[PDB]
């Protein structure tokens, strides 16, 4: 690798020169002669394995709080090697904890909305036993990260792995989504995306609404147990009807969204240690709602309704017809959230934070990783500035992983 | 090993083999992904190229180590012995044409890429040969309007010291002029090239959409100006659908997309002049051509004659004008009879086109960055497409402005 590589912006010829991809710790998928950045996703650690991954992070801690090479520093490097020695694992203190989440954030590579990394708050829960106790966790991860519409990002962060074989997971993709319910005449009510979910639910004792907008229940799994149902309190769930500012028909469209982006079945690394259940919330960029949610054709499917509504021409594809749907939408998800006063962000203004954020983590950090396929918007892409950002893409630790979904690997008591 | 690629609306799983066969850098390590990064001879080294290249055509037309595959093979090797190069066969310039065309990963028009016209100009001596050449070219492409695939080829590289060039970045385009109260007037991504043209003696008439003249470099020597001929040049007025306000901003675009910057390689020859042609997708006038903010920027303009809500971001007023300029885009060129396709349409034939690929030839090299349409990404079938990107020869290169290499 060499040691200095240059981004270019093509609208503005600034030029940024990152040094940070020489910590690099994993591969990305590209080899020399093939280039993977757009496919999706291209047993624990022995004692030798996690030896040196404790010392990388802890090196790292004790860099950032500049006391590298102190007497606290050798000492923790110490303790963590004898709790390795003798019990194959280890503990974080808090502060790594919370140190490590903030950084596993601030390395996705993926997310747009990394100018707030610094500010997340860590709910610590590597005491809980039950999976009563993640619901009570959970529960109040809701109440303090929704704050009324006044949204603050969060992670709760449940027991580490230990054999593999008792470990905490949320079976949920987010703390809160809408059921989806395939009809015997193969049409879906309620979102597709969430219909094999919703179906291990009904199976484990849910009783469904059958609506278009269920809120799912909980189902979580404690200690490798068999994963429990819990129904949130319908009061924690903050939700915005969507309507729009010129036509009046659009609320008649009886569409809503919840105001909680809560995913939950990612996997938080830290210093070789696994964390399989750790659930975090920022707020909506609302394309995700908008262009993702409701105009995706396998999810809520929207666009034809709001065309014939709207009355354009939906017989050459050459009207545009779906674009010019699609920005109305956008317009009503970003009008409605900002008139119930719920946090969310167009996008606009998040790309044009993450350039700032980008920019500012180069000259400090000494560069920014960034996987451009995910951090432009999936609409008016070249008329957001990080279209004309190049970006470089790599993964450094702490970091989120994908894992594989629970049901897949469940060993049923 | 062998690779797969999903298509997460449809569900849809090709596996990837053709990649295997690649031999070039895509810029990406194990540990960097560069797929956002814009840019990532001698006897000895010329052989094994031509080698290679003289190798797949005898095996796309089923005589793989036939008698005239290995007297072909033979003929290479003593021309390049005795003359340090090579020439191509009519066949083999075809050929490896509508191949460069065909691994051209960022292409999204690709469905089209044996439909292509190849002109052979590597008799060509003079920059008035290559005039003569390109208004040829512009001629058979334009074709009234149904517009025709097409590439014209000069002579190949020699020494690098008797290069062909087109010093315009494409065939025609419309001057930028730097105007004294800082502002742009014309096209900002041709400042540069039109003060060239005006520094050789070209007359420009000061207008927002004046067509430049070639500037033609032939065997090394200086550029010459030369004024494709008027009646040549389609153009298209832009006008709105519904809003009839639209015409009056004064905008038109030409018909011909015509990109003369590129360097053509095949089998280790590099052809430094090769203008090639096909038709514009609507997006690549109405978004970046004209709503760029280093481009046209007229997003305010229109937003203003549309009365829209300018003052938050958040009413989307910008996405809403962009919409607009692409319908009048498509409409315009529909209603003139000029071909276009809109992205909808586009990356629904890409779709089709990979799954031919895969099926025919085991793959199709793509790069996502730049087959996803710069609007609308999501709602067309491209943005839910996993793709692989990986380099295959005859290939299209950048090359450097020869303004920064010529020696006058
Ligand atoms: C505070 C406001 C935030 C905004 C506006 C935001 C925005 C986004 C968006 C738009 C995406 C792309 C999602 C998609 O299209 O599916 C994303 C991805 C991601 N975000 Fe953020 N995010 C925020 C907070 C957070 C927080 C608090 C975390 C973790 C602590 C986080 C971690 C991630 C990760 C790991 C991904 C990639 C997930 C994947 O690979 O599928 N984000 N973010
Ligand atoms: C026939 C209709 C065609 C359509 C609709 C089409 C469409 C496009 C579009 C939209 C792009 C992206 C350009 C940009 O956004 O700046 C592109 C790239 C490209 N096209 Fe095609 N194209 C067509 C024909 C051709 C032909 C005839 C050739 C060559 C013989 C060709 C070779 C290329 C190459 C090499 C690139 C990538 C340029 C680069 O790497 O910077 N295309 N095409
Ligand atoms: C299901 N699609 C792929 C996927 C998988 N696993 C998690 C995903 O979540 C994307 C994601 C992650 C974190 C986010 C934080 C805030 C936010 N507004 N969106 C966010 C979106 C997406
Ligand atoms: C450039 N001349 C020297 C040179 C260098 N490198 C390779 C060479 O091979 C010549 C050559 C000639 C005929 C061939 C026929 C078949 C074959 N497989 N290779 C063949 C190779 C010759
Ligand atoms: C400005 N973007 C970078 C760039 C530089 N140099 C050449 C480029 O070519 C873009 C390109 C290439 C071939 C095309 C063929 C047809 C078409 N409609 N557009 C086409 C657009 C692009
Ligand atoms: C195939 C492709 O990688 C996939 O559809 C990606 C493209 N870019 C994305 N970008 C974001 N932000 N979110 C996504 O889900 C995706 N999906
Ligand atoms: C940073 C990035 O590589 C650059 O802006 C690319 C992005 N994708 C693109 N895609 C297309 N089709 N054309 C372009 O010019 C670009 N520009
Ligand atoms: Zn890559």
Redesign the interface.
């Known amino acids: 690798?060499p040691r200095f590589?240059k981004?270019?912006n093509?609208?503005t010829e600034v030029v940024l020169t990152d040094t940070l991809?020489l910590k690099?710790t994993?591969?990305?998928?590209?080899?020399?002669?093939?280039?993977?950045?757009?496919?999706?996703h291209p047993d624990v650690a022995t004692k030798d394995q996690l030896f040196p991954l404790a010392k990388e992070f802890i090196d790292q801690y004790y860099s950032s709080i500049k006391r590298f090479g102190s007497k606290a520093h050798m000492e923790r490097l110490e303790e963590v090697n004898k709790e390795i020695d003798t019990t194959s694992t280890y503990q974080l203190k808090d502060t790594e904890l919370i140190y490590g989440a903030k950084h596993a954030w601030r390395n996705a590579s993926r997310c747009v909305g990394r100018i707030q990394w610094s500010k997340l708050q860590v709910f610590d829960a590597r005491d809980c036993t039950t999976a009563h106790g993640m619901f009570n966790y959970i529960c109040n991860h809701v109440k303090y990260a929704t704050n009324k519409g006044n949204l603050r990002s969060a992670i709760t962060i449940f027991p580490q792995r230990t054999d593999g074989k008792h470990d905490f997971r949320v079976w949920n993709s987010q703390l809160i989504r809408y059921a989806g319910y395939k009809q015997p005449d193969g049409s879906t009510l309620g979102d597709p995306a969430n219909v094999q979910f919703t179906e291990i639910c009904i199976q484990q004792g849910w009783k469904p609404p059958r609506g278009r907008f269920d809120v799912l229940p909980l189902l979580l799994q404690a200690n490798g147990n068999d994963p429990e149902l819990f129904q949130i309190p319908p009061e924690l769930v903050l939700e915005v009807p969507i309507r729009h500012p010129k036509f009046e028909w659009f609320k008649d469209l009886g569409l809503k969204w919840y105001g909680l982006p809560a995913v939950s079945n990612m996997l938080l690394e830290i210093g070789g240690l696994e964390f399989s259940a750790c659930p975090f919330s920022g707020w909506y960029m609302?394309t995700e709602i908008g262009?993702?949610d409701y105009?995706?054709?396998?999810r809520y499917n929207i666009?034809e309704e709001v065309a014939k509504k709207m009355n354009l021409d939906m017989r050459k594809?050459?009207?545009?017809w779906?674009?010019?749907a699609?920005?109305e939408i956008?317009?009503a998800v970003?009008y409605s959230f900002?008139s119930d006063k719920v946090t969310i962000v167009?996008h606009?203004?998040a790309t044009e934070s993450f350039i700032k954020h980008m920019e500012n983590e180069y000259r400090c950090r000494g560069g920014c990783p960034a996987?451009?396929?995910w951090i432009?918007?999936?609409?008016?892409?070249?008329?957001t500035p990080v279209?004309?950002?190049?970006?470089?893409?790599?993964?450094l630790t702490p970091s989120f992983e994908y894992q594989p979904d629970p049901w897949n690997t469940h060993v049923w008591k």
């Open positions: 690798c590589l981004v270019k093509w609208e991809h690099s994993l591969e990305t998928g590209c080899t020399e002669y093939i280039c993977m950045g757009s496919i999706m609302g262009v993702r105009c995706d054709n396998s666009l594809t050459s009207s545009l779906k674009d010019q699609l920005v956008n317009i970003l900002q167009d606009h203004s996987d451009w396929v432009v918007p999936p609409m008016s892409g070249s008329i279209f004309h950002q190049e970006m470089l893409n790599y993964r």
